[PDB]
Amino acid sequence: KLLITIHDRKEFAKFEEERARAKWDTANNPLYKEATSTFTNITYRGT
């Protein structure tokens, strides 16, 4: 629908993937203005 049609949803399931890092987030809100989900900002390498 958005870009890949696979992780566009799946990173909202395990939250461990994030291709575009929630980006589309259509599984939650319209874009990502409300509450998007990203670990990649704090889970960089493991610090």
Experimental technique, in short, is NMR
d(CA 45, CA 27): 26
Residue 27's contacts (CB-CB under 8 Å, 6 or more residues apart) are 8, 9, 12
d(CA 10, CA 7): 4
Q: Which two tokens stand for residue 6?
A: 């696979």
C-beta neighbour count of 30 within 10 angstroms: 8
Angle at 14 between CA 3 and CA 45, to 5 degrees: 90
d(CA 15, CA 42): 13
